[PDB]
Amino acid sequence: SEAEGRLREKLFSGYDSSVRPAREVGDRVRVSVGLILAQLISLNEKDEEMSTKVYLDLEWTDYRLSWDPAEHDGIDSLRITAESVWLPDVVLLNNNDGNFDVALDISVVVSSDGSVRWQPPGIYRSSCSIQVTYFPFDWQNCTMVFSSYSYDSSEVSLQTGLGPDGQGHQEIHIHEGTFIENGQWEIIHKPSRLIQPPGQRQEVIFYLIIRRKPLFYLVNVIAPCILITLLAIFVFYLPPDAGEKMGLSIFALLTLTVFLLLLADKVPETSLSVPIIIKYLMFTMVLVTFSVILSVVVLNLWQFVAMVVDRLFLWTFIIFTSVGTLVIFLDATYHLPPPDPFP
Amino acid sequence: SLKYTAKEITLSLKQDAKENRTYPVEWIIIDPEGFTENGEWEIVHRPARVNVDPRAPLDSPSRQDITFYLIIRRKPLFYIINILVPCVLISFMVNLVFYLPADSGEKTSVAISVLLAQSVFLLLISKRLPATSMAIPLIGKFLLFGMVLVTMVVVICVIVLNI
Amino acid sequence: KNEELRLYHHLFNNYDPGSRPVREPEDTVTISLKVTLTNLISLNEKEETLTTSVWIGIDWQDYRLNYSKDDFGGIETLRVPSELVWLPEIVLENNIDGQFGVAYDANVLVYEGGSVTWLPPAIYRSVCAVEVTYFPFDWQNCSLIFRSQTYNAEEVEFTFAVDNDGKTINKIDIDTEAYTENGEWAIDFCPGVIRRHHGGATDGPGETDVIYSLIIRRKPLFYVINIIVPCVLISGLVLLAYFLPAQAGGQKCTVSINVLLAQTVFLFLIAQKIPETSLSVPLLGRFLIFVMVVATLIVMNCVIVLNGNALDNICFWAALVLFSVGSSLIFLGAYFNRVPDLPYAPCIQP
Amino acid sequence: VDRLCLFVVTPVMVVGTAWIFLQGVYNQPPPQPFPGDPYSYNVQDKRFI
Amino acid sequence: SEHETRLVAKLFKDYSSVVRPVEDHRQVVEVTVGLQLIQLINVDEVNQIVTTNVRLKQQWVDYNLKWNPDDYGGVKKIHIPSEKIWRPDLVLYNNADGDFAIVKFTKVLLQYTGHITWTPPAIFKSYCEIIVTHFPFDEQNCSMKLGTWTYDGSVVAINPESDQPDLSNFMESGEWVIKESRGWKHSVTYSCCPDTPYLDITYHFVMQRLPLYFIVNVIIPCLLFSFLTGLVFYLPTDSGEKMTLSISVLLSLTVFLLVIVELIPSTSSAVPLIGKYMLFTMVFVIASIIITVIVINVAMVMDHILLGVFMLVCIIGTLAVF
Amino acid sequence: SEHETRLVAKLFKDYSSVVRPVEDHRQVVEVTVGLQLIQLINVDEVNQIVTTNVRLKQQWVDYNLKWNPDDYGGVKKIHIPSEKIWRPDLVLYNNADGDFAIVKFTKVLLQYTGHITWTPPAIFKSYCEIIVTHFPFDEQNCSMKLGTWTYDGSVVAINPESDQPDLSNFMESGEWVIKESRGWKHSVTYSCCPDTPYLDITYHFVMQRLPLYFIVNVIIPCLLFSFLTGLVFYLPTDSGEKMTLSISVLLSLTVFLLVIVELIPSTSSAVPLIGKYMLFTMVFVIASIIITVIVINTMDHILLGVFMLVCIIGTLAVFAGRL
Ligand SMILES: *[C@@H]1O[C@H](CO)[C@@H](O[C@@H]2O[C@H](CO)[C@@H](O[C@@H]3O[C@H](CO[C@H]4O[C@H](CO)[C@@H](O)[C@H](O[C@H]5O[C@H](CO)[C@@H](O)[C@H](O)[C@@H]5O)[C@@H]4O)[C@@H](O)[C@H](O[C@H]4O[C@H](CO)[C@@H](O)[C@H](O)[C@@H]4O[C@@H]4O[C@H](CO)[C@@H](O)[C@H](O)[C@H]4NC(C)=O)[C@@H]3O)[C@H](O)[C@H]2NC(C)=O)[C@H](O)[C@H]1NC(C)=O
Ligand SMILES: *[C@@H]1O[C@H](CO)[C@@H](O[C@@H]2O[C@H](CO)[C@@H](O[C@@H]3O[C@H](CO[C@H]4O[C@H](CO)[C@@H](O)[C@H](O[C@H]5O[C@H](CO)[C@@H](O)[C@H](O)[C@@H]5O)[C@@H]4O)[C@@H](O)[C@H](O[C@H]4O[C@H](CO)[C@@H](O)[C@H](O)[C@@H]4O)[C@@H]3O)[C@H](O)[C@H]2NC(C)=O)[C@H](O)[C@H]1NC(C)=O
Ligand SMILES: *[C@@H]1O[C@H](CO)[C@@H](O[C@@H]2O[C@H](CO)[C@@H](O[C@@H]3O[C@H](CO[C@H]4O[C@H](CO)[C@@H](O)[C@H](O[C@H]5O[C@H](CO)[C@@H](O)[C@H](O)[C@@H]5O)[C@@H]4O)[C@@H](O)[C@H](O[C@H]4O[C@H](CO)[C@@H](O)[C@H](O)[C@@H]4O)[C@@H]3O)[C@H](O)[C@H]2NC(C)=O)[C@H](O)[C@H]1NC(C)=O
Ligand SMILES: *[C@@H]1O[C@H](CO)[C@@H](O[C@@H]2O[C@H](CO)[C@@H](O[C@@H]3O[C@H](CO[C@H]4O[C@H](CO)[C@@H](O)[C@H](O)[C@@H]4O)[C@@H](O)[C@H](O)[C@@H]3O)[C@H](O)[C@H]2NC(C)=O)[C@H](O)[C@H]1NC(C)=O
Ligand SMILES: *[C@@H]1O[C@H](CO)[C@@H](O[C@@H]2O[C@H](CO)[C@@H](O[C@@H]3O[C@H](CO[C@H]4O[C@H](CO)[C@@H](O)[C@H](O)[C@@H]4O)[C@@H](O)[C@H](O)[C@@H]3O)[C@H](O)[C@H]2NC(C)=O)[C@H](O)[C@H]1NC(C)=O
Ligand SMILES: *[C@@H]1O[C@H](CO)[C@@H](O[C@@H]2O[C@H](CO)[C@@H](O)[C@H](O)[C@H]2NC(C)=O)[C@H](O)[C@H]1NC(C)=O
Ligand SMILES: CC(=O)OCC[N+](C)(C)C
Ligand SMILES: CC(=O)OCC[N+](C)(C)C
């Protein structure tokens, strides 16, 4: 491959990868930023961090790397190691672990007209504000902010990657034939937006609107809690002569408290809001404490009066619990993710 | 390859020869001198395929790949002994509640203890498995069914004690 | 022009950091070592790792870097990257995470007269065998072993730094402007010893290493409040089951079994907080095991009695006496386990 | 009522447990690595050129 | 880009990153240091470590890196790799388990006047004395002592960019609120080097915890159990379940004390107020069990009196604690 | 004052670290390999990974690195970076999650005779088949297969320094005691390379667990809970504590079984003996609860005697097996 070596030596003779390819001193470099999501690795509420495997799609023009193919044996494109050409220092600004750069500096593709295309793989752990409220039916709106770390908006102009037909397909690209579907989160909307500066820098923000699939938490969390609540309600039907009402009530309260403690590790530690499921659990624990108190009062109290008070408490607690649970469930289910990514 | 594409590099399976005839090695190689039997997973099949996507551009990196597959089967005896048997025994213990006399005053206690044991087993298994919503695990479905049955049995016992 | 550039070019244009600063191969390089402890980061008993932040003051004479301030405009110190000068390659030999060297390659200071000083900061995680016998009133004799990774005792030789008064600092240095007290472990003594050994059995080249013995002491107050008192209350509650009636409705066996379960939870907590090493059993763990055995015997006695009031009372008195004696004997060893009186000077000056 | 609840729940519990365990045990990997492909991809089934 | 290529080639032809960028060795390199706090990643009370995401804007004039813009078509600023140039060796004195110095050598903005602005990112896992006394309503004063390691105050002088840290880009954390922040310059003298004081800039932040998460997940169940603790004295002895309730409450309190021990550092400096409340509740539970056993071994009146006393003591303790 | 620099310059002026350090390419490089075990850092049973701190002493004669001491003032040894010289590519075959080869490139000691001694430190996270049967009194036989990856036995021959690993600097571990150690050299033929057998040195260590911690924290509570089971038959029915005590014993046994199954790897090759004992005790407790329910609905003394005799016999058998 003599012609390829000769052309490469011609192109890199006198080249400097540290200098951006501005022709005139005022010229800006336009960098089209596209994103291809290969795998939504995970979302962690405790760390408020989303881990994703992506392929960037950075495209720019480097006038220094243009050539006429007819003089160089018809070579119309070249693959060159990325470390040898100038690269825009596009980094993930909202990363959570300090890994700004890409995972592997694969070769760029340079066209004869000077168009350089780079599609490096990246493993990224971005910070994502978790919507704690509607757990487990909640939907999360995570953002990936890509910007040049050093160059200002007067030096490198970011742009959203266009579609293959030149359409303004400002979306995260997902090849449905090869995308590694996440087992817990479903991607609904995946838009991208160019954010203009308020020495300031432009940003490209990619949005992943992922909805939690609630079946796992419905089966493993919500159903046991509902069963424990039903048992705590039925505690008031156990006659005093059996001598097992206090035992059952205490066991139900302890099980609900254990479930709350377990869920506290699932939910994020941030206290900007209380998850509706956590609010339901706290209301249920308060109800069970009041039920224990009323059972102790009934035992202290005469037997017919105690039974009548027990039945009154049973009916009132059934009504209150049913109303509260129905309202909470309706509120949780109603707040579906919006059909518009920018409401 | 990420630095090269189907226009630059052609991937293919290793060919091996027997009786002066060549054939492709379309499977994962296991060398009896270097291979260590894993204690949980038995390799049932281990094929290899060169995958070429006809719709992908010839100059895209995703057009071609070589995929080696491991179809590994879990050896369940450990889980049967340590998990399945205690869970099944605790679930079937709930059937004894109907037999204890109401004068004993321990039927609800037994039912609640069975429910607590089922909850603990469900917590353990949910910790041992990913939170995938694709399907409920078989043992998880059994645990949910057992918990529902235990709740119904507790309700029945409470009604019987009331009567 | 900057005189520092002239000094740097004069010193380093013909300098080889590979070879030792000796005129003859048989000469030893004397190293002045001064480990300054900034804080004791932690002592993980479960992993048996002591994590400490130190500054490693290393001073030596390098005749190749000798200069006089009169020849270079009065420069008395030159800062040079450490990769450019020869270093004794002092490493923590008894580390556990594999980080032998320092955490930051700070510049060396080349003073006039040829003295080279290096004071890098380093975070070190080192092997410290933990004696959990007298926990939580225990003290730990952790050790830090510094040696040259490359040169033997006939090539590089260690000596302790000398204080302004001429006294050798044969101990870990503590600077009041840098030292931050650890809230869990106090530091009692920190003597240093330069050990020398023979090499191979055929009288091979000598070996030399500096061992600093951090004799540190646990501050037990927290463990008194959150561990000792709950366990004592649980063990006391064991004796109350005997006063419960020996007839239907008496929950003596239930109470005993529940207290046993609580003591088992406390045992699990202690096993989580204490390493799995089997060299010794913590006296608190021995007390917990004894209390569990006593509780099992109390359950047996309650079952026998139920199968009575006088027997219940007599068993109450016997169990109370036995529990009190056992608790006293167990706690006496922990109380008596003070740090021994030692000839070393205190590590932290009053 | 206790006896009726026994006679109702116990067979239902047994049948559900047996169904779940039989559906679990009967699971096996397919005889071919790729469904719809008759080739076994096995060392003994060398596909000579 | 030919102008900038020629400029970059000519600047670093014989540049030395070893010596200081002064014209005369008697001069002091004056470095402006501004800490920008981007995110408060974590506060670990147990390990007493605060992990923060920061940018360290260091600005100084390099005497040798000046150029005339008209020689290069009017190029007035360039971006260069920071490993090329001399840099101040800012070290975090109170590093706990991270890197002491900067490790992400991002680009340096160099202007024709020689002014260098370097804004490297860092993750600082600084040591902080976590005060657990008022947990979870506590406030933590955490600091970051940053200074040149080998250069003393007579050789390299560092000055704070502003009296307060730059919080403009601060991603507001959902657990801790920064009540105030400030940066103080100091000139402390160490025993290593008595002839020369060393300058440092200690940035400090008075963070305050948002207690809602800990109130809901810790405080409320403990309050419920403490309230149920006194209820046992109202249940008649004939029920045969007073001891079962008392021991279930004791077990719940033991579990929550275990949780709190995992939520607080084991340092013996001071007892947390929630820890003190839990210990008091455990002592009260032990006393209540002893008195119940004594009563089992008049009974109704004692039960009523003990119920009233327990309820009043519980309310008094809750008020005195909260 | 400059002869060592001159020597280092002369040695490496045209030295090649790619070719083998032999005078003739048909010769075999003789490498002496001595594993020094400094500390047994960890033995993770559930992951079946043994983490060990080692110094991998390798000694060989480099034909091209000789010098005459009289040319350099009597310098008989120098220290040089290992990256400059040819080195044997010793790889740990049974690596689990660590590095295959050495990554800490310390300096080698070169002598005037050409003898190079290299003692790089390493943290080997090797694979070991953890036998769970006799746990927690089990003896584990863990090995380290170290060998030249690309050089075959006819090209580079490795020989053990001594029949046993060097334990002179071994820091005594608090959980495992090295009862035996031995190194065996083997030549094996791999399917990759049928015409060239490859040499390896398999060091092996028979390490015995110290059971005291597990005896205190696991065995004693399990024995206490097993003992508490038999008391139910002596406890009268009128007490009402039979069912509560039996349910509490069952729950405690279940929790201890979960703890044991968390402490033991899920490999299905062999069942543990303590796990089998726990399962047997669980079955016995279930049967006891069934019989207690039968009695309550309706024997106690006969069942108590049978259970006590069977428990004593089983405990004696378990003690004999563990001893
Ligand atoms: C373990 O996991 C791995 C993956 O991780 C599994 O491997 C997969 O196995 C499945 C099952 O066999 C494979 O799916 C089949 O693939 C073949 C190959 O097709 C490919 O190459 C063709 C060119 O060679 C190309 O035309 C194909 O394109 C087709 O598919 C794409 C993607 O959807 C479309 O965009 C195209 O338009 C086009 O449809 C492709 O690149 C296919 O032949 C096969 O298709 C048959 O089955 C489909 C559903 O079963 C039908 O929709 C199809 O119409 C077609 O139907 C079949 O037609 C045959 C020819 O006439 C006929 O003989 C057969 O009876 C008939 N079957 C039916 C049911 O009607 C199908 O898509 C998949 O590619 C593998 N993935 C790999 C290798 O990466 C592996 O199985 C797992 N192992 C287990 C579970 O044990
Ligand atoms: C949280 O925790 C942080 C630390 O982590 C606390 O930060 C401290 O804040 C106080 C003020 O609240 C700071 O004191 C100020 O310090 C500056 C700088 O002083 C330095 O430089 C001076 C210049 O030469 C020098 O004089 C100083 O010497 C003083 O201190 C030494 C001992 O250190 C003493 O011996 C001397 O006599 C001097 O007192 C020192 O080198 C100083 O300029 C400030 O002066 C103010 O106060 C004086 C009167 O006190 C007044 O006259 C001035 O006009 C001015 O108002 C002041 O002393 C302290 O330096 C900070 N320390 C650190 C390590 O950051 C913070 O306060 C805590 N906050 C809360 C809410 O808990
Ligand atoms: C712990 O686990 C380790 C491994 O994980 C065990 O280590 C093994 O220990 C045994 C002894 O206990 C070793 O056997 C010895 O091996 C040496 C070396 O043999 C090699 O070199 C020979 C020289 O040419 C060669 O003949 C050998 O070939 C053998 O293998 C081939 C094919 O596998 C076979 O065809 C041959 O017939 C040989 O079997 C091999 O390459 C060998 O010198 C020893 O011989 C002594 O003992 C035998 C009888 O045992 C006797 O006949 C001889 O005269 C001589 O006295 C012996 O075979 C084995 O190599 C070790 N394996 C490994 C991988 O390290 C260890 O024992 C376990 N300890 C426990 C459980 O306590
Ligand atoms: C997921 O989160 C994203 C942010 O993390 C959401 O994007 C936000 O969407 C809202 C709703 O449209 C936008 O708010 C609007 O912003 C525009 C532009 O504001 C700018 O210009 C005006 C001057 O016209 C100026 O006043 C502002 O300060 C800004 O400079 C306004 O015109 C509208 O009035 C309105 O405020 C946010 O700007 C936008 N943020 C970003 C970063 O894009 C996204 O919608 C979320 N998705 C879901 C499904 O909730
Ligand atoms: C804290 O830990 C330190 C490190 O473990 C302890 O220091 C060591 O303590 C042991 C106690 O057994 C000493 O061992 C004894 O040493 C003497 C002296 O002989 C020395 O010299 C000969 C000849 O060179 C050599 O063979 C020995 O090994 C010693 O180096 C012997 O007579 C005894 O037989 C026995 O070996 C260590 O010498 C001692 N080393 C050091 C460097 O101090 C320290 O005691 C511990 N302190 C506390 C308070 O617990
Ligand atoms: C290090 O260099 C100094 C400076 O040259 C030496 O000290 C003396 O310097 C004067 C310069 O006026 C010379 O005339 C003397 O010959 C030097 N030597 C003595 C002994 O006075 C110094 O000797 C050198 N060596 C050391 C070990 O410090
Ligand atoms: C000279 C030198 O290395 O000083 C570092 C120690 N310091 C900065 C705390 C005095
Ligand atoms: C040639 C080569 O790389 O062989 C490596 C494989 N081995 C050592 C198992 C034969």
Side-chain angles (χ1 to χ4, degrees), chain E residues 123-139:
Chain E
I123 288 183
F124 283 163
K125 302 190 180 81
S126 69
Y127 174 81
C128 179
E129 183 175 12
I130 300 293
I131 300 300
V132 79
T133 57
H134 297 92
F135 178 88
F137 308 102
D138 54 310
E139 62 196 285

Side-chain angles (χ1 to χ4, degrees), chain D residues 9-13 15-19 23-25 27-48:
Chain D
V9 178
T10 306
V12 169
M13 167 68 82
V15 166
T17 301
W19 170 256
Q23 184 70 4
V25 170
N27 182 44
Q28 291 185 356
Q32 270 85 344
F34 309 102
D37 193 338
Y39 190 52
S40 59
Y41 293 84
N42 175 48
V43 192
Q44 299 183 357
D45 301 316
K46 302 172 181 177
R47 193 148 62 162
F48 296 97

Side-chain angles (χ1 to χ4, degrees), chain C residues 139 141 193 195-196 211 213 215 340 342 344:
Chain C
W139 65 270
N141 180 6
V193 177
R195 298 188 300 180
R196 299 184 180 82
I211 176 172
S213 300
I215 299 176
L342 291 169
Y344 319 119

Side-chain angles (χ1 to χ4, degrees), chain B residues 39-40 75 77-78 81-82, chain F residues 48 129-134 264-268 270-272 276:
Chain B
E40 269 201 70
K75 300 167 180 179
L77 180 62
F78 179 90
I81 292 173
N82 296 284
Chain F
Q48 294 195 322
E129 183 181 13
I130 300 294
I131 301 301
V132 304
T133 58
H134 299 295
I264 291 181
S266 45
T267 55
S268 186
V271 64
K276 183 179 165 175

